[PDB]
Symmetry: C3
Subunit: 40 residues, 3 copies
């Protein structure tokens, strides 16, 4: 079932975003692969 | 065109995040595949 | 290093979600492919 995200962080060394979830014992995360780049 | 996300939720049964969007009639969502796991 | 997401926007022409990152000059983003659709 859907649960809120407590915070989003991204890492430009590992190219992953991590969502810390409000669920259960508090130690669950969602993680996915991302492009990370500088824009103009 | 990029539109704000009003709400982000993640679901460890379907392994999807859903972003609720601020656009038009208010019923648009984004959805992507994610890993969901416990940490120590 | 993990850095916080300032804000999240999604685009239903490019089918990309963009996370604006709190880092350096403020022009860094994380981007990933997404479904975008209308709900009922
Ligand atoms: C002078 C300096 O340190 N400039 C920074 C860049 O090094 C850095 O780019 C990353 O550099 C590492 C080290 O070689 C590479 O392995 C990465 O692939 C580079 N990442 C990208 C996306 O180009 C950039 C970006 O910083 C990275 O991403 C940020 C969002 C943040 O997570 C940082 O912690 C991370 O190092 O920053 C320049 O200022
Ligand atoms: C006893 C109990 O209900 N324990 C929970 C686990 O079942 C659950 O892990 C999921 O279990 C389902 C069905 O048993 C598996 O098909 C899934 O693959 C499991 N998901 C994961 C990520 O391992 C966990 C996690 O709960 C899930 O993810 C949460 C973030 C939330 O979205 C839940 O609604 C979702 O069911 O929780 C245990 O406590
Ligand atoms: C009359 C009108 O302009 N209606 C809008 C639709 O055009 C639009 O659906 C997109 O339509 C383009 C071509 O017009 C297609 O190539 C895309 O595949 C369609 N996208 C989707 C997801 O169906 C919709 C949705 O608008 C898009 O996504 C939004 C969330 C936002 O990012 C918009 O800037 C973007 O155009 O909106 C109708 O009103």
């Amino acid at each position: 079932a859907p649960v809120p995200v407590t915070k989003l962080v991204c890492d430009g060394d590992t190219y992953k975003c991590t969502a810390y979830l409000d669920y259960g014992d508090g130690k669950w995360v969602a993680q996915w692969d991302t492009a990370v780049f500088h824009t103009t």
